[PDB]
Amino acid sequence: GSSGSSGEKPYVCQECGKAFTQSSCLSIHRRVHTGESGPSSG
């Protein structure tokens, strides 16, 4: 379900744009947030 208000899991990465169902997740994420990705893939 969804509510009609803001302030839902403030922790939201912007570099790649990935959310997390749990908390204190973005923390460890930033740790392994090195390198980039492009359309070119194997």
Binding region for Zn ion (CB under 5 A) = 13, 15-16, 33
* CA atoms of 16 and 21, how far apart (whole Å): 16
Give the span between the Cα atoms of 20 and 42, in whole angstroms.
Answer: 27
The upper half-sphere exposure of residue 8, i.e. CA atoms within 13 Å in the direction of its Cβ, equals: 9
Q: Which is nearer to Zn ion, 37 or 41 (CB)?
A: 37
- Closest to Zn ion by CB, 3 or 37: 37
Q: Shortest approach of Zn ion to residue 14 CB, angstroms?
A: 8
3 vs 22 by CB, closer to Zn ion: 22
